[PDB]
Each structure stands twice: as structure tokens, then as C-alpha cells.
Design a protein around this nucleic acid. Structure first.
Lengths: 118, 233
RNA sequence: GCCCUCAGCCGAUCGAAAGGGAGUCGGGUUCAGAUCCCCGAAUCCGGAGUGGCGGAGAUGGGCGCCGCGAGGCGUCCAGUGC
RNA sequence: GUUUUUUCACUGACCCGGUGAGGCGGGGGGGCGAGCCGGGCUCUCGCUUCUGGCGCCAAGCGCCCGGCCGGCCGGGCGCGAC
């Protein structure tokens, strides 16, 4: 072995990982934000129902921490219905307004009549 | 016989002809500060002037006498720490149903029995880091008449007994079976270390510079010796 | 997971909605929204375990013959282009 | 042996320059040439000057071992920049 580089390089000495005896916290955090709480309510406005009858969409009021895929999974777990795409805005009053596009096999007026609202 | 398709290709290593290979650059590699300091610390003993109180450490006992002293000290080694607990358990069983002479250690035990005049031989390390512990002891053992030797390795001196390090070792009591072999070592150490302490006090040392400086001085010295041989004549 | 072997850079990071800065046009649609909703045509990037298929790679040249000739046997090679 | 001043020169204190802290000092070896008598003294030298490309991951000699059935396959260590 000969000293090749004139710069003294520090070799890969040692590092380890956590092998504890007991963890830090006792009770871990569970899923606080539930699927019933992540979807608050739909908007029953006359122009909104006209938009639902026209373009076959749905207008939901969603919590701001949710994502566009999380709205799709939260609707698919509860109501068992497919979602084409999700388009969300945020109102100036401080609420998220989603636009869930449905597939034409399940009608939006029919799924509204199933849950009861009109 | 051989295949003529293979061709010898001599790459002549020259400036502007071929690239140069690597080399052992142990002086050219930038060493770290602590390595450079601990390497120049041994150089500082050669460069600077050495007083005789430090120069007396340079006298080292030779290999045959050192191995003979280690073989003599191997006979009177203390027992194991587990054997101490086994001997205490045997004493407890003897109670339910006089120490042998050993070798001492540590300067606070040794130096008191030096003036109490119980030891016969002293073993000192040569490169101990608390250097202030040693200095007064050879000068005092010269006046007391106790032989002292300077051996190699405080670690191997301490690992004889069930310890790690040891500063000084005193040979307090031996039996009659190991008397003449100890007395020959006492006579050898007394003729080696003790009987020329008046030359140890007057023997100055150090002032040995680098070999580049020695060669640069000796080149001019040989040049002057050559010029004086044919200058006037 | 260990032992060999190799690697440069001017030093973490911040710093432009007038700097560099991939990937959509028209039509209609509401009392208030349009490159955002709808229709009809499009384009770029990422992944893919058996990549699901088409195509180069890829299919030729020389010898012994059989065979009227086609065509196929054994023996030598060419191939990561015109 | 002790004390005052002058001359010098170190280096191991102190000040400054650069680097990726890359070829520092001696002994010894080789081509060519010099004076003295095929021997010895020291000096000399140590690969690139014809045109806007370039030489980056050694060849070559030796010393040994493993596997397969004297022959094939795969490796290690030196001289090679005294």
C-alpha cells in the first residue's frame, strides 16, 4: 500500500442505529380524522343542483387538510362509487369546495335520491 | 516457437513522453495536526538540549538481563482476583468447620519502604507520562544503596500483575531458593546503573539536529578539509 | 453484512410571479366563473414483474452430394447496418 | 572557570508566499568527454524546440498455486520510478 492522494481523507469509521430497551411514548396516536369527519356536507343550492343536472357532478364541502385523491378514497370507501376526477377550490369564507365528477352509469340525481337530499 | 503477434510495448516514463505513476508520499501527504505533533514530540528530544536528569532515562537494561528479571518476577506473581474470592470462601469454610511474600507496586507504597529499607531492587519504566514521579528516586536510591533498573514497557510491566499500568516495582522479600539468582541481578544492576552516577551527573546530552543539517555542515567541513590539504602547499 | 477497488472540487442553505425557466387550440355554457365546467381534436414527462405485439438484430456465402429441376441433409464462417 | 562589547550562522522560538502540502538531502549505478599513470581522483550528464491533436486506467521477463480430464480453464507475488 502506498499513499496515493496527498489529501488525508477520513475513512468510513462507524455509525449505528436505534436499538432501544423501551420506546419514548406509551400510547401512540390513532387516526383522528375519520372518513365521516373528512366529508362535511354537500351544497343544496338551486344553481348547484342545476349544475349537477347539467354536467353530472357533485359539489362537496371538504376539510382543508384533505387531498384530491383523499376525497376519492373517502367517497369510494363510504358510498362505494367510482370517481372520474376531483376539482377543488377554496371559498373566501374559509371552506374547500370540491367538484366530484361521477361516471354516467351511476346518476347523480339517483345517488342524491338514495341518500335523501333533493 | 512463440507467437509473433504479441508485441513488446516499452512505455518510457519521461517528461512530455508518458504519464508518471504514483509514489509513496508519506512525507508529501498533509498529515493531521495531532499526528504531526506526536511525531515531532519525539524529534524534540533530539533537537533541544537534554539535561542529565532526563538523559539518565536513556540507559536501558539489555535483553538477556531483562528476560532473566522477568522470569525471576514470574515466580513471585500474586494470585488471580477470582482466586482471592476462592481463598476467602476457603477461609469462611475453615472458620465454619500468614501471608506469603509478594511484590509491591505503586510509588506511595514503594518510596516509604525505600527509607524504611525493605526493598532490594527497583524496576522503573523508561517513557512514563507522569515524568515528575520518577526523577528524585534514582538520586535517593543512590544515597540509600538500592539498585534500580530501567526496563522497556510500562504496559507490559503493569500487565504482569492483575493491573493495567504500573509506575515502579519493588522487590521486597524473596525466599532462599531464589536468592543467588536475584543477587547476581543486583550485582549486575549495581555495576550498570549505580557505580557511574558521578558520570551520569556530568554526562550532558542532546543537541543532535536533523540529518539534512548534519550533511550540510559536514559537506562544508569536508570541503575545508580538502582545501587545507592543497591550499598552502 | 464484511474485505479489496474507484470518484475531486471551492464548500450547508437562502435569494427574481420583468433571469434561466418541458407539457392545449376553438365553440357554447351562469343572475356572478372561464386557457379552470362540457364537447371535438391534441401534446410532454414518470413507472412497468413476466415488458403485449409488429420491425431491424435476421438470416447470407463456400464444399460433398441427392434431386431432370425445386427443396432438404452433414461439414466451415459473417453479423453491435446500408 | 565568571563578567562587558564587536564580528559572524544557524533553527528548535518568532514573521511571510503557495500547494491537491507531487518528484527534499546523502550513499550508490549508467552513456559520453577531460588531465595524470588496462586500474584509481573528481568534474559532465540523467530522454520532450520543425505545423493550434493527443498520449488517462503497462507492456514485457521471472517465481508459485487452484480446478477439470501429460493437456485445457482461472489466479497470486516480485523486476519493471536504484
Amino acid at each position: 500500500k502506498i499513499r496515493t492522494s496527498p489529501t488525508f481523507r477520513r475513512p468510513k469509521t462507524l455509525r449505528l442505529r436505534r436499538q432501544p430497551k423501551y420506546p419514548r411514548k406509551s400510547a401512540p396516536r390513532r387516526n383522528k380524522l375519520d372518513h365521516y369527519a373528512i366529508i362535511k356536507f354537500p351544497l343544496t343550492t338551486e344553481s348547484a343542483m342545476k349544475k349537477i343536472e347539467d354536467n353530472n357532478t357533485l359539489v362537496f364541502i371538504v376539510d382543508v387538510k384533505a387531498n384530491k385523491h383523499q376525497i376519492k378514497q373517502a367517497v369510494k370507501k363510504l358510498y362505494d362509487i367510482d370517481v372520474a376526477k376531483v376539482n377543488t377550490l377554496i371559498r373566501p369564507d374559509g371552506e374547500k369546495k370540491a367538484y366530484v365528477r361521477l361516471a354516467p352509469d351511476y346518476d347523480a340525481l339517483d345517488v342524491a335520491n338514495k341518500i335523501g337530499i333533493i | 516457437v512463440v507467437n509473433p503477434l504479441f508485441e513488446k510495448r516499452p512505455k518510457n516514463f519521461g517528461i512530455g513522453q508518458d504519464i508518471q505513476p504514483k509514489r509513496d508520499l508519506t512525507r508529501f501527504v498533509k498529515w493531521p495536526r495531532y499526528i504531526r505533533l506526536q511525531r515531532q514530540r519525539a524529534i524534540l528530544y533530539k533537537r533541544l538540549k537534554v539535561p542529565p536528569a532526563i538523559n539518565q532515562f536513556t540507559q536501558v537494561l539489555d535483553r538477556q538481563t531483562a528476560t532473566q528479571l522477568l522470569k525471576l518476577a514470574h515466580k513471585y506473581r500474586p494470585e488471580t482476583k477470582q482466586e482471592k474470592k476462592q481463598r476467602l470462601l476457603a477461609r469462611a469454610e475453615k472458620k465454619a468447620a500468614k501471608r506469603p511474600p509478594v511484590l509491591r507496586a505503586g510509588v506511595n507504597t514503594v518510596t516509604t519502604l525505600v527509607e524504611n529499607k525493605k526493598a532490594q531492587l527497583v524496576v522503573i519504566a523508561h517513557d512514563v507520562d507522569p515524568i515528575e514521579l520518577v526523577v528524585f528516586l534514582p538520586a535517593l536510591c543512590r544515597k540509600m544503596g538500592v539498585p534500580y533498573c530501567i526496563l522497556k514497557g510500562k504496559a507490559r510491566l503493569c500487565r504482569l500483575v492483575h493491573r493495567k499500568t504500573c509506575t515502579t516495582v519493588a522487590f521486597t522479600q524473596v525466599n532462599s531458593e531464589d536468592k543467588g539468582a536475584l543477587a547476581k541481578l543486583v550485582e549486575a544492576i549495581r555495576t550498570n546503573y549505580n557505580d557511574r552516577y558521578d558520570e551520569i551527573r556530568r554526562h550532558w546530552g542532546g543537541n543532535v539536529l536533523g540529518p539534512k543539517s548534519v550533511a550540510r555542515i559536514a559537506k562544508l567541513e569536508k570541503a575545508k578539509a580538502k582545501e587545507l590539504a592543497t591550499k598552502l602547499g
